[PDB]
């Protein structure tokens, strides 16, 4: 379970991602359920000017004008938003499922769940209990040795953060670059004259008020997501958390003989701190020696 | 079950927000389907005049008019209502959802639950496990009184939340009241798409106008209620100093005149939870006297 | 859930009729926006048809101006008014377990009723363990010490029925005074005479002969439901339910000491009794000093 | 559930397969919607030339033009993408769920899981009935699976075929992705009925189709590169043998046997998921452990 | 459940049936989604001739032409694919759901299940007793009931023969008249008084798409034919009318179990195509010395 | 469920009938989805004649022509198929659902289940106080039910009449379908008289969905013919053996316990019809039907 294995960063990131997906879906829905460009030939008691063009030559005119006079961004913005949202979504689903980094999370979560609600921790401040305590101590030592050398628990996190930050920067730049070229009334000087007669036509993209407005809203939302990502990166460069400073536990437990948590164990403890400040205490409790000997002696 | 600390105000808030969201959804659904503008040129057995304009010049006329004539409010009111309603709904839920502030409320609620159910309180109100449980509850009460009674952080967050809600309510009422007088039926569009189409001035009729305007008033009305609730809210936390309680009535009630008058976060939480069921306060304050510790020790002894 | 016994027949009939009225309102709104509304034509006063010579957008301007300033306020937005009134009635009916004191007292009473209805010791005493009887007795003291001190829940149903009756009267008045304005063929004289060309016009509001009939049906429902609330006046006005006197149980059980409760305990007891005359007998056992003394002696 | 027996050459490939299925679905949907070709007869302040052709002869013109004047790839690209994607999925599907050998894989998985948490495993690292049953299961595995070939060959072909398919897909969707254009120049002979001989056509979904085709080219390149790396891994380890050296030297047991053929292949493949079940299997397969268990049976 | 009797033939048959049903569904979806034959009257600065005929007359022309010009395979092809697919799918999956052998299938399944995880079976094969004796006696009685009568040795044979015949017929028809699914044809309808013109040229819009799904379906039919031919070859090239527990005698220790023939032979031989050792788990009940040893242990 | 109370005849019947319903449904779809008669006015390098009729006068022409020009069978075929299939399906299951005759079948099912595998049955058929109690209870229940049921004929009359009605309906369906199947053609000729309004009197109509209707009707005739053949065969097998008296002659001769007599009327019919599912429950229910079993149970009570 990752409910406790998710800092304050990755609930706001998740909510903003879901909001972006909803915005993109609505934009694409409006793009599909519309009429798009509707162009007519420029003519350079009132009475209308009878253009005298059929209902198929007008379909050809509109088709050529759309994909020869409307810029790149204005015509596919929902697709670009959807793709970038997919990138920022499945760039935060790797380290929880990447190759070789799946079993360790489950093992650590199982250990944390198992070694939490026991009488020994409360009594810190018959044969079955002692045997279970010794088995838990041996398993904890074996697991801590297991996650002690190959530490894919910061490289994955740091890499995910770096990719997220780079994507945020590029997305903001691109979005703010061309969001000035999505206009309503374009002047398509498309030259197909041997068939449809008229030379230059004017065009009026239908959905170009929701396009710019949705682009501004999406740019603001992506700005918030990028600032949150930058702050999360800053927390990753504010203090070397590759080892844990088990000073509070050692001082306020009376069992100050446990080794200091380092590498993946320290990373997991620091992350769990954002959930509840007792899981690392539980691991340290089932990470000592004198208390283990006392448990063995009380087992008999 | 963080429901004990949610007064009648936070109960009406969810319902009013749901009503506003439903109104917005219906409005957007209506604006999506029905053809919006139907504009025609003007003349600025009586036979009908023949304009002689095709079925694409008519669509261009309609598209230009329904983007250069109809005002902003009438064009996009449902979206504004949806955004404002979502913001208002989110604001109230961000008092206990503050990152890292869920712990204090959870501890207070669980400690109150453990204090309101033990038989030790009734025994003191006139074995072996009883004294141990009473002593452990007293120790937990001291620990919460040590940590959960450190600073008035929570009472400094609800005040800000209520102030923000009031400011938003004033803004929403002002904007809607000022600009809900420009959603009209027969607007006049004077657009110079004249060489292309043929005629200069025209009249337009936003089909889904007389409905939307009516809906607006409903929203305005609903908004008032929410704002009004906030008003009474900004009288529970303003007319009295809710950061220093006084459990003198309960102490005189059960006889033990030894439980002190709590202050700061403990006082705020007690005085806020009391309005839901004003009896758990006495039970909670009961496990705050040295008589309880002495009785637990003697019973254990 | 678990509230099936807090409803006399009046509540059940009201729920059924309200569901039906909501269904009718939904169907009405679907019809009101499902098909072609008012169709209007311009009055023009060997056979030969008269050629009006009006296009297919001039006609839509005519129809839209002549079906928003000619049909009366009832005929146009009728189904919406029906839906609004149905929702108002539903909220008025189901607001007995939402207010704070209502929820608290209802929770306490429901818990006590569930505990007592499955009390084997109650049946054992009624035939002529250990501290479970004492726990039940303490729970009963808690219940009829918190709940049985005032009529907090007794005014809620004392006002909700009144409000529902007033609303029923108002609805009958409105839908019966303005139900003669839904006429099929209306005459609209709108002065859109320069744009379209012809001044006066006649209109047929196609979906009228159905809708008007529907209104009658709606009134019929809002009649029967109303009368139901009327009888709910009697059970709240016939004899003072402020006290419940289980005098019959005293003779039928052999223990002439069961208390005669009053106030909100009495109200809830009488109402639950109207749902089923089986909970009172079972719950009376843990309400007498004789049973407490018998349990205390049997412990010895 | 075959979740452990899946190297890095089994996760990214599956994900890219899902992506290919999605791209094909979107393309097929788009071709289902929209209108396709819209063609008009050419002339082989200016009033437009009145073509003056009915509304059914125009449908005849468009129907002829979009059948005799649009290239094979561009006319049916989404269907081809879907078919090729399903084909490349099916081959990988039977790799670990082959028709007539799924029993062996499940048996090996069950035996490995049982051997993972043996009570004597920790004792050797530092009550005989369960150990005896596990020893019997291990003996059954050594008798049946170790003598059984024709399991590594399946995982040889289920990577050999995909490489050829990837090369062919790149080749086919390489050249014929320059003949998916916008405007064509149809010159058909329907002149006695429609009236005009040569006409110009403008396929509607062509730019988006070209973009989606380039995207599918990139994703297929990724999948093919993953397959090529997997094949190179198979061909750059000679991993049809077992050499219990690390677990033996780390435990001290001097009776660890060497597995060949199917057991060796399974060990080498699962050796990417976690290098711990191999130690448990080696411990269960050490005859000194069996002798110690027999002595302790007293 | 009954999946135990499912050789490679059953897997291939189920898969190809799914594929054929998919192709037929995708065809009959488009069979009426788009518009069928668009036909216009032939005329037997370029300027377009004006036909001058209304919309209803054009609808009548199309209706007469695309029912007097398009061949009995170009028009109702998807329905033919669907009918043939249903026949070739319900011809199989009839052994397991036919009265007259459904009880036999149930008895075979129950006998397989009962003599599979017997507590004494572990001891007997590797090296409580009353239950094993009861199961053995019940199995023996069931075998004696099913000993005489090939009520199951001919059902599968006839099903395979039927599928072979249908495969040959389908690969004859659908490959002999796949030369008429075509684009523009020449309708020579005679409706001249009403519409106005005699000879018309037509274009069946979904032509060079049906004539490709046709080759796809012909390939799928060929594949299912190959699988059915191999199954038939397995059926009538080796003597499956009598089993042989030769390996059991030389690999278990009880050299007195007889060879069950007829229905028991067919059921055992078919099961052996899925997992051989399972038969061994029942072979312990095929020796009377096993019952004697069980009685001795119970003694 | 009395699935075992159903011969092969009703195994395929309530299957083939299902198929019939399917065809009907499809037809109804192709009756409401696709179009119908598109009739045009008759005229008794050329240019086409311009009829000069609008898109509503053509609607009135088509509506009158395909209501007074297309015969009754072709106008509504599919509804007839659905109704006839419904009649056959309803008459199919009026045996085990009628009021006042479901009880006997349920009692027979319960008794057959009790006696199918009973330790006393095996003990008597091989060559505990609870065992004796169960055997005595079974013998008492069997003795009660034997007098309870086998007095009338409410178990053979129902099936005989149901088969008779099904055969009659199959005959009628074949007659009607094979009779008026030469009146579904493409080009019918509507010489209607609406000329003061439209303008032309003699017009020709071409029912759009005609050939598909003829093909589906031939299919339905074939399937109903198969069902009729099955009904006829079952009828021959039901009225030739005189199943009102069943004697376990085979069981008596292969067991030698000549104390179970021959049942009569309804019990005989129920046993003989159960004989078409599994001839193992028959001997099982026959075993606890002799004085020897009750006598042995009474002796074992001591």
Nearest of E297, E235, E294, E296 to residue E269 by alpha carbon: E235
E-facing residues of D in 109-168 (CB < 8 A) are 136
Are D207 and D183 a contacting pair, CB within 8 Å?
Answer: no
Nearest CA in chain C to B50: C54
Question: How far, in Å, CA of C4 to CA of B120, rounded?
Answer: 36
The nearest CA of chain C is from the CA of B55 a distance in Å of 9
Q: Which of D86, D25, D39 is nearest to D67 (CA)?
A: D39
Dihedral sign, Cα of residue D86, residue D90, residue D92, residue D97 = positive
CA distance A60 to chain D (A): 7
Q: What is the dihedral of CA F182, F186, F187, F191, to 10 degrees?
A: 70
Question: Which residue in the set B48, B185, B186 is minimally distant from C52, CB to CB?
Answer: B48
As a whole number of angstroms, the distance between CA C205 and CA C184 comes to: 5
All residues of chain D having their beta carbon less than 8 Å from the beta carbon of residue E275 are 103
- CB-CB under 8 Å, B41 with C57: no
Question: What does the alpha-carbon distance between residue D202 and residue D40 come to, in Å, rounded to a whole number?
Answer: 9
Closest approach of B76 to chain A, Cα-based (Å): 10
| A27 contact residues in B (CB cutoff 8 A) | none
Helix (H) / strand (E) element for C181: namely none
| Residue C177 tokens, joined | 């005074």
Cβ–Cβ under 8 Å, residues A283 and A269: yes
| Cβ partners under 8 Å of residue C162, min gap 6 | none
Backbone φ and ψ for D190, nearest 5 degrees, come out as: -80, 90
Q: Measured over all CA atoms, what is the biggest interatomic distance in chain D, rounded to whole angstroms?
A: 112
CA distance C4 to C272: 10
Interface check D295 vs A, CB under 8 A? no
Which DSSP state fits D236?
S
DSSP labels, E110-146? HHHHHTTS-HHHHHHHH--HHHHHHHHHHHHHHHHHH
Number of CB atoms found within 10 A of residue C198's CB: 20
Phi/psi for D41 (5° steps) reads -80, 125
For chain F, report the end-to-end CA distance as a whole number of angstroms: 39
CB F245 within 8 A of CB F262: yes
> Virtual CA dihedral for F190, F191, F195, F198, nearest 10 degrees?
20
Helix axes A127-146, A103-114, angle to 10 degrees: 150
Q: Are B46 and C197 in contact (CB under 8 A)?
A: yes
What are A15-23's contacts with CB under 8 Å, separation 24+? Answer: A16/A221, A16/A224, A16/A225, A16/A228, A17/A85, A17/A88, A17/A89, A17/A225, A19/A221, A20/A81, A20/A85, A20/A88, A20/A218, A20/A221, A20/A222, A20/A225, A21/A82, A21/A85, A21/A89, A23/A81, A23/A214, A23/A217, A23/A218, A23/A221
Contact between F48 and E197 using a beta-carbon 8 Å cutoff: yes
d(CA D247, CA B195): 88
Give ∠ CA A42-A48-A50 in degrees, rounded to 5. Answer: 65
Flag if A40 and B52 touch (Cβ within 8 Å): no
Q: Which residues of D touch A105 (CB under 8 A)?
A: none
Q: Are D169 and D220 in contact (CB under 8 A)?
A: yes
Verify whether the Cβ–Cβ distance B57 to A51 is below 8 Å.
yes
Number of H helices, E strands in chain D: 13, 3
Half-sphere exposure of A252 (CA within 13 A, CB side): 7
Sorted by sequence, the CB contacts under 8 Å of residue C295 that are 6+ apart come out as: C121, C133, C134, C137
Contacts of D193 in chain E (CB under 8 A): 40-43, 49, 201
Contact C93, C18 (CB under 8 A): yes
Residues 6+ away with beta carbon under 8 Å from A265: A144, A147, A148, A244, A283
Cα separation of B26 and B28, whole Å? Answer: 6
Q: Do C195 and B277 touch (CB under 8 A)?
A: no
Nearest chain B alpha carbon to C64? B207
CA distance D132 to chain A (A): 23
DSSP letter at B248? H
Residues of chain D with Cβ-Cβ distance to A51 below 8 Å are: 48
Q: Are C40 and C62 in contact (CB under 8 A)?
A: yes
Q: What is the largest CA-CA distance in chain E?
A: 114
Range 57-86 of B in CB contact (< 8 A) with A = 57, 59-60, 63-64, 67
> Which pairs with CB-CB distance under 8 Å and at least 24 residues apart come from F198-204?
F198/F53, F198/F57, F198/F60, F198/F61, F199/F53, F199/F57, F200/F41, F200/F42, F200/F51, F200/F53, F202/F41, F202/F42, F202/F44, F203/F39, F203/F40, F203/F41, F203/F42, F203/F61, F203/F65, F204/E194, F204/F39, F204/F40, F204/F42
Chain D nearest C-alpha distance from E38 (Å): 6
Name which of B7, B43, B185 is nearest C68 (Cβ-Cβ).
B185
Neighbours of chain D (3+ CB pairs under 8 A): A, E
For residue A254, the surrounding DSSP H or E stretch is none
Number of residues that make up chain E:
299
CB–CB of B52 and A47 under 8 A? Answer: yes
8 Å CB contact between B218 and B1: no
Give the SS3 label for residue A109. Answer: helix
Short-list E122, E108, E115, E121, CA closest to E137: E115
Q: In chain C, which residues have their Cβ closer than 8 Å to the Cβ of B48?
A: 42, 52-54, 58, 196-198
Residue C197 to residues B51, B291, C20, F122, Cα–Cα distance (Å): 11, 96, 47, 102
Cβ within 8 Å, pair D193-E205: no
Phi, psi of B205, rounded to the nearest 5 degrees:
-140, 95
Q: How many CB atoms lie within 10 A of CB B135?
A: 18
User: Strand (E) positions, E5-152?
Assistant: 38-41
Token look-up 């120790």 returns B139
Residues in chain B: 301
- Report the distance separating Cα B58 and Cα B69, nearest Å: 16
Q: Are C12 and C63 in contact (CB under 8 A)?
A: no
What is the stated resolution of the deposited model, in angstroms? 3.8
Measured from the Cβ of residue C232, the count of other Cβ atoms closer than 10 Å reads: 22
Q: Which residues contact C261 (CB under 8 A, 6 or more apart)?
A: C144, C148, C243, C244, C269
DSSP state of D8: G
Least CB–CB distance from D63: residue in E43, E47, E203 = E203
**Burial of C275 per CB tally in 10 Å (0-12, 13-18, 19+):** middle
How many CB atoms are closer than 10 A to CB D43? 11
Beta bridge partners of A41: A201
Could you write out the DSSP letters of every residue in A149-173?
S--TTTHHHHHHHHHHHHHHHHHHH
User: Half-sphere exposure (CA, 13 Å, Cβ side) for B162?
Assistant: 19
Distance CA A287, CA E150 (A): 71
For chain C, what is the largest distance between any 2 Cα atoms, rounded to a whole number of angstroms? 116
Q: Which of the residues B196, B198, B199 would you substitute to probe the A interface, choosing the one with the greatest number of A C-beta atoms within 10 Å?
A: B196
Long-range contacts of A158-164 (CB under 8 A, 24+ apart): A158/A236, A160/A91, A160/A92, A160/A94, A160/A95, A161/A229, A161/A232, A161/A233, A161/A236, A162/A233, A163/A91, A164/A88, A164/A91, A164/A92, A164/A229
Whether the Cβ atoms of residue C36 and residue C206 lie closer than 8 Å to each other: yes
């Amino acid at each position: 379970a990752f409910r406790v294995l998710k800092p304050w960063w990755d609930v706001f990131t998740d909510y903003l991602s879901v909001a972006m997906l909803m915005i993109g879906v609505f934009g694409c829905t409006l793009q599909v359920m519309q009429d798009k460009i509707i162009c007519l030939p420029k003519r350079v008691e009132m009475k209308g000017l009878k253009t005298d063009l059929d209902l198929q030559q007008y379909s050809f005119i509109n088709q050529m004008c759309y994909e020869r006079a409307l810029h790149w961004y204005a015509k596919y913005f929902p697709y670009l938003v959807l793709i970038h949202t997919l990138v920022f979504m499945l760039c935060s689903n790797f380290w929880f499922k990447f190759p070789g980094s799946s079993s360790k999370i489950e093992h650590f979560i199982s250990i944390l769940g198992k070694c939490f609600d026991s009488p020994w921790t409360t009594r810190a401040l018959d044969k079955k209990e002692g045997e279970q305590a010794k088995a838990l101590f041996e398993k904890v030592k074996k697991f801590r040795l297991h996650v002690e050398e190959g530490d894919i628990l910061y490289a994955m996190y740091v890499r995910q953060t770096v990719l997220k930050v780079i994507k945020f920067l590029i997305i903001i730049a691109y979005n703010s670059a061309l969001v000035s070229k999505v206009q309503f009334t374009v002047d398509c000087n498309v030259d197909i004259q041997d068939m449809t007669g008229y030379k230059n036509f004017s065009c009026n993209h239908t959905m170009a008020h929701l396009f710019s407005k949705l682009s501004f809203c999406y740019l603001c939302f992506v700005s918030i997501y990028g600032l949150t990502c930058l702050y999360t990166l800053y927390w990753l460069f504010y203090r070397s958390l590759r080892e844990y400073s088990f000073e509070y536990v050692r001082q306020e437990t009376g069992i100050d003989d446990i080794p200091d948590v380092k590498n993946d164990f320290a990373f997991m403890l620091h992350m769990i701190d954002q959930y509840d400040p007792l899981y690392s205490k539980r691991f340290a409790v089932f990470l000592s020696e004198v208390s283990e000997n006392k448990l063995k002696q009380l087992n008999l």
